Design an enzyme around this catalytic site. Structure first.
Site, PDB file in Angstrom:
ATOM      1  N   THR D   1       0.795  -1.216   0.000  1.00  0.00           N
ATOM      2  CA  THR D   1       0.000   0.000   0.000  1.00  0.00           C
ATOM      3  C   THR D   1       0.826   1.263   0.000  1.00  0.00           C
ATOM      4  OG1 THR D   1      -1.978  -0.796   1.160  1.00  0.00           O
ATOM      5  CG2 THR D   1      -1.415   1.518   1.433  1.00  0.00           C
ATOM      6  N   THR D   2       0.286   2.289  -0.647  1.00  0.00           N
ATOM      7  CA  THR D   2       0.901   3.593  -0.619  1.00  0.00           C
ATOM      8  C   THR D   2      -0.202   4.625  -0.691  1.00  0.00           C
ATOM      9  OG1 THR D   2       2.926   2.862  -1.739  1.00  0.00           O
ATOM     10  CG2 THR D   2       2.584   5.203  -1.529  1.00  0.00           C
ATOM     11  N   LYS D  33      -8.874   3.314  -0.298  1.00  0.00           N
ATOM     12  CA  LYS D  33      -8.165   3.613   0.926  1.00  0.00           C
ATOM     13  C   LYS D  33      -8.244   5.040   1.433  1.00  0.00           C
ATOM     14  CE  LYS D  33      -5.075   0.005  -0.634  1.00  0.00           C
ATOM     15  NZ  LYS D  33      -3.698  -0.285  -1.067  1.00  0.00           N
ATOM     16  N   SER D 141       3.710   0.530   2.696  1.00  0.00           N
ATOM     17  CA  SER D 141       4.900  -0.197   2.256  1.00  0.00           C
ATOM     18  C   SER D 141       5.642   0.459   1.095  1.00  0.00           C
ATOM     19  CB  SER D 141       4.528  -1.630   1.867  1.00  0.00           C
ATOM     20  OG  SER D 141       3.509  -1.644   0.881  1.00  0.00           O
TER      21      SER D 141
END
Lengths: 222, 222, 222, 222, 229, 222, 222, 222, 229
Positions: D1-2, D33, D141
């Site tokens: 995820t970013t 998200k 991450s």
């Protein structure tokens, strides 16, 4: 896995299933687990595939090695001992997950009574061996189911034919209760393999013969 | 275990296998894993049987409890939230071997567009939910196989009958690759169970229809 | 990583992805995982890169070493055995994180029937080998996805061209579900690599042909 | 995820990827998200999905709960403190694998100067918060890659549109180096989501706008 | 620590920082991490200092040992293999806290095209190697930062000097985000070291060019900071 | 981190660096570590950021809470005791990685001799406090370097500006030897923060003043 | 397992049960545990079957080996020592689940008084031996039960035949209380085995004699 | 231990052995393991004796308690649920060595058909229950053996007496392979116990009937 | 320790040894392990002394407590249940080294046939109980030896005195093979203790009859040993 072996007057039959697993996953559908070791011996091995295969291959070489060197075959007792030694040798690795247990079937050419010459020998992880006196034996994750099946069906084993038929039904019962043992695959045409041994030596049973027996059993239970 | 759910025009179908295991041993052959939770919802649960059954039972009671109390059913989103909370509540137990994962399928009566009203929701061990947007989903030890199967078969889904057919084939594929999922049992006449939901409500699929599909799939691979 | 191999009438094709990872980080974008081991053999290795490369390199030297020494190539069975011995010998290191699993593909010159001469052999961490009889196999973190994909696409394999296509699509499906497997990179122009083997020997597939297949698969899914 | 967040004159933009993973396996392709928490705030959460979702949901309820109770919104500092308390409370759970880190972005109506009302706040696992003074921040991450990318691109941000473009390029760079972050999916038409906030409030960025930006970034790198 | 390497037309440049740490404490300010291994090779090692230094020293001796013995230098592939073997051999010790990862840069006098004869090879802790095809690579605690920096700056590399500049800027970017990497020390006059390799061989870059480059980067950074927010 | 405090005639000065770290990574460049707790007190906290901030915040509220409730400020000894109690209360969390150590500086309006009404108190992890009698103290990962520096530079303190100068030089020496402590950032214009307290109360030192001192120190070392 | 030995005037008798177990499962029904080691010695071994068998086999070979080499048998004390050395050598393995304990019985031809030439020697896991002076001894999981039985029956032993009857009754009492010791199997006709040794040498007792005795004991308890 | 239950037309029969063990030692020879729970229900419990007895006792009280309180007996489903809850409640204890598993047999008077009214329910250690549809079931250390025996004998069950005969033979087969299950003791006159349930209620089977069947089974095997 | 109990026509006898140990050390020579719990019940407890004594004491109080409260004694089954509950409650403490196992002997006044109204109940560490049906039982570190002894001697029990003698002989056999069980001490005059219970109630057996019996057993064993070889 389930490998069965039974004595009949004048010989032995050994049969094994074809499945291979990696946890819950089926990883093989056509593994051959029963090997003709020499003219009068067959070996079936359960457990860790890599080790099982290595055992059967090394064992056969060792038996033939002795024969060529000494000009005659090892006595049946010698064959048992050699196998036992190999198993004992793998104990450390077995403890670490490389466990493999063989089942030995043979016809003893030097036995006094020929109709009684059939031999079935089981082995434990420490190499302890036992010559089966009750007629049949089994090894592998479905061996209890197979043995309990043969216990009720053994009276029927009057010859090598009904013996082959019983063997197949025991394997079928094993697969019926043990997901790690493969039943007859009618869609793909894959069936348990089997070896028969009598005074004329060890012979692979024709797949078509096993398939016929398998289909009959299925029709019966249907 | 494998439970699958998929969307077809105007509906959803959910189907599950019938196997139960205790390690390698087959401990059940006719377990029913798909429940009609309310008139427009079905739940399928995988994992530890004791927990799975408790979940479905409790969940249906909680949904009906709300309706009787408030005079109106819970919105679909509310149904999802209640199920997610139940899973989250079981996390400590899950970590200790009591893991149970559900799969939710339903028809949202309040959806804007009816051919599109089918809903599929998957859940992870922590209660995280996800409304599936790609048409199908699966849960259990054979779910990866089933999903890989539906990925190639989904374009064939155009109605209830084909959706049902694809679901059964997915389960078949799952069983083919996962020993813990049970394939159709022709000898005993035991087949996967299934629920179809559309604007008229959730209905149990008749065994006869499913058996016809299973034989056709089998005959097809033969 | 995902490496696939399949049999087609008259031969085999083996293809692999190009990704390398360090945890979640992409560490490589163009790693070559499929090697031509000798004129009729190809090896694809998954797992720890350092060990994978060493294996392929050493294995090819060992095969050619035998050929020069004895004037004739090793039989296909001998090749399998040598590779299995190498894997088994890495078992301790593998238990410690240096795990490497190979996939072997080849054309057996000595086999009686040429259409069936193609060979595919898989290996487990203990060195256990299996000659695949169902036409295809895969190894690596994306192998399940690839195998499930090939299962539904295999019936379209009739020659090397449809074989190579099914291989690339299987790798594509693996990348679609396994973040550790690299899909076709259109921006950088990096694609899976592949080797085809038939009676005329092992030959590297031209990047341009794979690029065309990859792009087609992509436009198709779009 | 970013998840990324950056300041442009008179506003903030926050954007996140759509991937979900279970180890190496891709378990989600369209996860949203970034949430609009209230009219002038947006939250992006990374880590354990189940926890991340709960956080965003609870947080928005708490903010609105205060507003309705007291007739006025919480000050921006109060909002920060409430979020930090939520994170600190989850610290023990986080240590057992239930970690969730949020990133907060907003426009402060009580700020003295409006082109300077934009706010970005990052949080660590213990609830420690920091109001970012350098223009941008990222979590997940792939945050290092995204931050290093923005560092070199920030000078191009002169308004909301260019800010949105730099955000998307940062996410693209994150996906390029972190397998756990999903890049733009042209085949399926799935793109990063984004929220823009200025004096007129928080608004979801239309997918069509991000897709164009994504395509141009891809054309440029190609 | 951060060591970078990049390919430029007709050559390769490798540069490293000068910091040494013991936990949080700065234990060295002038460590030289890039070594000229042979006339056409350079090695930069990150990790445990004592091991890193031994590696470079031993590796150089091994390369020259072969040359004298066989009358000809090892092929570039042979050089790679020898270094990979050395790294693999340290795998047990590495697990015990003696890890050292090298970065190899060279010019292959036997490659086909002289403008592309530059070589960059990275290694993982198990000795796995990889020849880079994107023009740059980095190793050390600041390597991720340096690579993401080079990713955005690589298109400015059109020759040895611009390559050297980009390398220095990448090290600068690494020190900006990694406390274990040392930035240019203007007060003491200590700067990253660098080696350049082209058809004429490997050469140490003069401190003066590196010092000018570093001040220029800093000045640029100040200006840009003031221009923005 | 490094926070320093020293006594000069007529008051005290406390100054801290601006760095934040996550292992070796620099995670913050403008953190403010010195707070004005009340009109005559300043607190500087080292260690886990989340805890350090909570402490300073809670502590100031506590001090003011007493004042409003009782109509008069707490005596200096009372302030010390209340801070020590707070530290002791965090001992278990600290043992678990949540350690925060404060440094207290103040001017005792109730002291006998106003030239030395200045106070500097240090604390250990168990809450043990010590009123420093040698003129200076420091806390944090660079505290040893700062204290050894002040020991040699203290005789130079003859008033507020020279004290402020020594404090800044101590922080500079701390950054010179401790990577976890941030030195003056000339490129970004970020400098250590400081608070000066004398009979007329606690005052934040202007950044320009510190920048001048920092540049003068740097010039001198060059 | 239970193996008993007792002295009678002019000789010794040793008898053992036939059971083999794997946990709670009966794995053998006809194992022979008492071996004639040489003309005047018998060995009975309990514990791990594989090791027990190896011991008896190796021991007999070692005794004969000495005889052939030196032209004379080993003294009885020498025989004891050799057996003790063998047990001691297995101590590390025994600690890991490979424990085997032997019971030795013999007639000492070189003894002074022939009516007292009978010998019974027990051994502990460290190889410590003890020449029994009280007339009987036993080894195995049922040895306590057998010894307590013989304690009450020993006075009935006046000759070989009553000695044999007491031995069989002791084994019967052991099986009555120890599930790991097998009682007489009337259905299958399997009975304990026994060896009698006197001045004329060691002789296997005929099964029919033992079965008679066993039936009398059972009738007695009925 | 082994407890078996089976369906015959119009009824159910449940029978259990009488053995009790402490490791290898036989600690009981007349334990009664099958209880009449209510007029139409019987419970048999295996595992830790203390817990097994407590369960049967508590369970029968809880069922009678409901009846007296509500004036009507619990439905068969309710009885199952209550027993499952009791088993689930014992899970923490079961994990520590106090595991007890129940087998439930009953006749349902509210069943649609009287002949098919018989019920058999098995339970796992987490309280998961399953209504047996194949006619028989077993629990205990010898349950596998008993189930495999019944599988081959079930076709002989045509009435209450043949069903009791198969039940006793199944227990006999269990004792033959599991040393922890007691076979008929002819010397002491102790035999398995059994309960038969039909439309007229649950009744204890007279020892004399069981004793005849047992001797007959034994005579047959001889 | 060894405590034995047996049925005889019309009654029950329970007897126990007097030893106490701390590892290999003899720490007690006169411990009394058999208690009259109520008029028709006796309890013998083996294991951790502290716990054994507490059990007997608490148990007797619980039985009399019920009687006074309800005006009638607890049925024999109720007595068993109460003792089993007490044992199960100690299960966690037992796992830690505070294990105590009781043996219960009684005469059931409400049994149908008075000649067999004697009762013997054994208990395992989890509180599992079993009403012995073969006539005798034993508990403690010498219980196996005592039970194997009584098996061979039980056919001699025809009354109260022969029951008692078999019981003393069983304890003597236990002491012969278990160093933790004490045999008759002739030098100090210490002998096993015993309780007999019949329709007239539980009574302590006089030391003198037990001392006579013990010497007689010893004289017997001595003669027998001299006759044999």
């Amino acid at each position: 896995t389930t490998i069965v072996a039974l004595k009949y007057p004048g010989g032995v039959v050994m049969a094994g299933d074809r499945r291979s697993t990696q946890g819950n996953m089926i990883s093989g559908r056509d593994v051959r687990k029963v090997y003709i070791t020499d003219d009068y011996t067959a070996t079936g091995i359960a457990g860790t595939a890599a080790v099982a295969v290595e055992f059967a291959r090394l064992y056969a070489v060792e038996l033939e090695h002795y024969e060529k060197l000494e000009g005659v075959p090892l006595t049946f007792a010698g064959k048992i001992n050699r196998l036992a030694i190999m198993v004992r040798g793998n104990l450390a690795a077995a403890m670490q997950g490389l466990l493999a247990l063989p089942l030995l079937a043979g016809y003893d050419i030097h036995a006094s009574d020929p109709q009684s010459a059939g031999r079935i020998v089981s082995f434990d992880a420490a190499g302890g061996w036992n010559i089966e006196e009750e007629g049949y034996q089994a090894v592998g994750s479905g061996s209890l189911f197979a043995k309990s099946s043969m216990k009720k069906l053994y009276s029927q084993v009057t010859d090598g034919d009904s013996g082959l038929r019983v063997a197949v039904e025991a394997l079928y019962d094993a697969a019926d209760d043990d997901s790690a043992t493969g039943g007859p695959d009618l869609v793909r045409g894959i069936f348990p393999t089997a070896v028969i041994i009598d005074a004329d030596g060890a012979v692979d049973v024709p797949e078509s013969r096993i398939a016929e027996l398998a289909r009959a059993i299925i029709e019966s239970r249907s």
